[PDB]
Write a protein that binds this ligand. Structure first.
Ligand SMILES: NC(=O)[C@H](Cc1ccc([C@@H]2CC(=O)NS2(=O)=O)cc1)NC(=O)[C@H](Cc1ccccc1)NC(=O)c1ccccc1
Length: 296
């Protein structure tokens, strides 16, 4: 894929490759999302989950939430991309984390961006101010947090008040990824992704990681495109066969608009390429990425 990256760069055709991809993307029914009773469960009117992969809450009332299950079969990993929750869908958000047995949550956005609210404050900021979602009978408590330069990892306790059960949810918040933008560098992004991988949150023994930004397609799609590609070129007989454009389209069969700009697509090539060093054998690389990320 590196000779392709060069070819495209030298040609100045990212907008074209990206456009081809948008044009080719899957189009599936989003009936439930469009139901009139779910208008206030959707942050954006042009971003809905496909009925076939949408996540269904386990409640008879209304099992709708703007979230999609991205099941990458060959890569053997599943992600749930959802929108930044709305004031009225925080309980729903956590009901899904519980019901889906998720271990981690990856936030790649800020609550406020461009002076506009892009996501509700769905997690407690102070351990003393825990959150109780009366509608889904859940309790959320902040136990600790490790603040780095461009991201914060939080340790939350999600308690299902109905079953009396407790679960620790790791929160991975990338705080310096601008909307429609790209990480500050391949190393800062890779350092973050691998931070998420080491915790175990992406392991098959836990439910699918919940990944979201504001719409749950741009930055989320990017985070996932890179993770899935790195998974494929580690289990594939020939690492060179992995086609990022083709892997992206596959992902778009599960949720629309993954990757929102040509520059995020390009960045995705840079991340995978760089990340390939680790995949191909060299342990050192990661330690260098961390140094470069300047998390301190
Ligand atoms: N296209 C857009 O920019 C947004 C969707 C959107 C929002 C954020 C992103 C972000 C890009 C990124 O890098 N990461 S991300 O969180 O996916 C990517 C796409 N959509 C809207 O803003 C819609 C546009 C629209 C308006 C009318 C009919 C159909 C589409 N406005 C609204 O949805 C809206 C909502 C409430 C009040 C008024 C308008």
């Amino acid at each position: 894929m590196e000779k392709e990256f060069e070819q495209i760069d030298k040609s100045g055709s990212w907008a074209a490759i990206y456009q081809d991809i948008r044009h080719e993307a899957s189009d599936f029914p989003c009936r439930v999302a469009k139901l009139p009773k779910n208008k206030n469960r959707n942050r954006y009117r042009d971003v809905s989950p496909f009925d076939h992969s949408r996540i269904k809450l386990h409640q008879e009332d209304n099992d709708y939430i703007n979230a999609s299950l991205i099941k990458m079969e060959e890569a053997q990993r599943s992600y749930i991309l959802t929108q930044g929750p709305l004031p009225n869908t925080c309980g729903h958000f956590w009901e899904m984390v519980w019901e889906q047995k998720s271990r981690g949550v990856v936030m790649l956005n800020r609550v406020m961006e461009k002076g506009s609210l892009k996501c509700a404050q769905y997690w407690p900021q102070k351990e003393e101010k825990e959150m109780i979602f009366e509608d889904t009978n859940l309790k959320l408590t902040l136990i600790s947090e490790d603040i780095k330069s461009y991201y914060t990892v939080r340790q939350l306790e999600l308690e299902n008040l109905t079953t009396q059960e407790t679960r620790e949810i790791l929160h991975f918040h990338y705080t310096t990824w601008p909307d429609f933008g790209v990480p500050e560098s391949p190393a800062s992004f890779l350092n973050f992704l691998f931070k998420v991988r080491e915790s175990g949150s992406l392991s098959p023994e836990h439910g699918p990681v919940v990944v979201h930004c504001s719409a749950g397609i741009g930055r989320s799609g990017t985070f996932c495109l890179a993770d899935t590609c790195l998974l494929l070129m580690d289990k594939r007989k020939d690492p060179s066969s992995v086609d990022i454009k083709k892997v992206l389209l596959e992902m778009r069969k599960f949720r629309m608009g993954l990757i929102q700009t040509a520059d995020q697509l390009r960045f995705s090539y840079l991340a995978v390429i760089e990340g390939a060093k680790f995949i191909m054998g060299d342990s050192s690389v990661q330690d260098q990425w961390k140094e470069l990320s300047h998390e301190d």
